[PDB]
Amino acid sequence: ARIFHFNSEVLTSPTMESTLFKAIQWSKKFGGLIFFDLNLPLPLWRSRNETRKLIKKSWDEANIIEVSQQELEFLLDEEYYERRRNYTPQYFAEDFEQTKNRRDYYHYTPEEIKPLWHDDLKLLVVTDGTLRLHYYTPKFDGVVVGTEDVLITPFTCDRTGSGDAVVAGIMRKLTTCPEMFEDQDVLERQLRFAVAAGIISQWTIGAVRGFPTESATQNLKEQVYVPSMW
Amino acid sequence: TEDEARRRNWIERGWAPWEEILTPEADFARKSLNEGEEVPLQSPEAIEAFKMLRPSYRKKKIKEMGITEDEWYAKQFEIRGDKPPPLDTSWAGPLVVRQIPPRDWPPKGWEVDRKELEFIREAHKLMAERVWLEDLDKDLKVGEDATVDKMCLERFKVFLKQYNEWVEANKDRLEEDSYKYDQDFYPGRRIRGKDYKEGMYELPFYYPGMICEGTVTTLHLYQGAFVDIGGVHEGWVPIKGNDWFWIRHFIRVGMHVIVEITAKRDPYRFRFPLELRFVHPNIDHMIFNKFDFPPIFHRDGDTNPDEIRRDCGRPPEPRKDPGSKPEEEGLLSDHPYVDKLWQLHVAEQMILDDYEANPPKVILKTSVKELDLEAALIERKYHKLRRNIEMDEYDSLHWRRSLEEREALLRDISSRQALGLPLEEPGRYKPGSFFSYDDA
Amino acid sequence: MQTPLEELYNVKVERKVSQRRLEELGVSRWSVWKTGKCKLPWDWQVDQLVYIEEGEVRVVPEGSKRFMQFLAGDLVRYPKWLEADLFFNAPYSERYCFKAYADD
């Protein structure tokens, strides 16, 4: 295996946690990359400090990390970003775009992310659903603009499992396109494939039942994005 | 006609022919559509506007005029039409000043030496002294005779000593209140954070009548010009609406002016605590739109409209006139406590009855510890009642109170009618278009 | 708001009045008004001087969420055109006098 993938649910079990770090040792010995898909279970949302201590060892062993926007803000400071989103200028907007009162897609700076960065981390992805994919590398950072449409099928839409399709789409392109780690333009184009997979996954009841094929994902990507973004 | 309507729009509706800086496409649209729909453009303006639709032609035209591109970009933002007659500000004699401490020193809730304060307050009687221009020459001190040590400024120096003590003890608290109350900075708010510099004058340093030199920092089309007069709050000259159409030619950002303080207000309630007027240049003849009242904040703790209008000088909320004279109404004698006495009376009587027998709804709980059963039982065994008599004596006290108010009101009416004083609260009670058992 | 109700509504108070001031005003000849726990709405048509002898009253101006509290020993001047609710929670006793224009 070239990518070793695990969630934080294994950290809630004393047996699996010991087994997990032996699996990581073997995978690294054989050159595999470690993918930490956080997906915090219910107990790990109680307090920031306890969760950070619980995940720190597994966080440091990971080469690729995927977290949601809510998980990232919870791990750094939940109240600061909530206050940031609710701020409204008193007299006039600082720019024309701030007048439109659009949804907040704040891109975290690499200095804000710095408490969570370590030496072995190659790629950090922060997902705002399928709407935004913020990516962070040692050399560069940026955001991929996505979209969602569950109102196109109101009676079959089900968001469960769409986070897994995005992660699976990332791993599909990482293994076959190793230059994603070093080329920003290549990384953005390949991440749009993961966005398309997440969109299709939300159109069916049931996670496994609705997981999309490669050709369907590639078709949707070319339909949604203009040809220059393929 | 099309002369009074234009004047009517200017005066009543605030119309002004503000410049419209158009793109080449917009400029071509207005020049070409005046000719027809699909016709050969004939007017030299529309023909030139057709040529200007290509920026390559504009660059060639710009080079032939010898100017740069940015200069051409700046020439389109130029005021069109005629210019107002240039200002001619004349000084009404020399500017003669005194160093007079503000009358409102010290601030409320700040304790100073009352002996020093009375020494300070002696300078306020100097305003009554008369000065004639025929007399500012007889004993004029100049040069070496006009150094600062030669002047008597003892009363102003005592004010400065108290002012500096107040500044060092309240500077941090005032900045903390600015952040608590004012979310964003705006001209007229307290300068704070990195923009604050030590030595900026606090509000108690200013008073109406002072002459200041300052620079114009902000022009607002609906508010006026804001002037930095060396304080932690910028001054405000109220100018709004059509007046800016001509005044913008003379009042510019960054220019030095001489201003006079006309009012100083509380920054918590009023948006612009320092109100100014321009002394140099004089633009009194150009200002026609006036603020009825100084603008205020409507803050979190302002829930009662009647309290808000008392904090400023604004009129009461108008009401329909009742159409009845208060001095002709019947007197009131129903004491409000009688309803409570009645409940106690009923509670005692029902407790007495139980004592004998066994020795849309509203419920009124009554306590046994607020009843006087020792007197009630003696009255019960003896047999209106005492409680009924107690209700009449409370009614008599209330009736006497109403009688004395009415008697004072009748005398008050005669005095006010003779002296031309209002009978009702001014602003209240606007007029229309503004919006038998006993004998048997 | 920050401004006290007494300042806003021009309710002059002289808490802890000396006996000399009482005799200068002739309070001993003023009429007596008393009450128990109740609520009294009133709109003052003339100024009224009130000397509280017992108890306390909390005065809520019309539309207000705050109150003014006056205790026994205070001399209160309720201004003309004031509208308020007077609240009592215990036995209360006062001596009052209504003042027309000038007068006192």
Side-chain angles (χ1 to χ4, degrees), chain B residues 181 307 335 404 411-412, chain C residues 2 31 34 64 80 101 103:
Chain B
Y181 296 135
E307 294 179 30
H335 198 289
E404 296 197 13
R411 307 198 322 274
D412 189 70
Chain C
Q2 293 187 350
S31 299
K34 66 183 61 57
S64 180
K80 186 192 187 75
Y101 183 77
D103 283 15

Side-chain angles (χ1 to χ4, degrees), chain B residues 103-136:
Chain B
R103 292 186 57 90
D104 59 350
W105 180 259
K108 297 306 171 185
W110 180 252
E111 261 62 28
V112 302
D113 181 17
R114 305 300 293 189
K115 245 186 64 64
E116 286 181 350
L117 183 59
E118 281 300 320
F119 182 72
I120 292 171
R121 286 177 168 178
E122 296 171 0
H124 294 142
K125 296 182 180 182
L126 298 178
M127 296 296 289
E129 315 303 317
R130 289 198 172 273
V131 170
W132 298 90
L133 291 188
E134 308 90 347
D135 292 332
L136 303 171

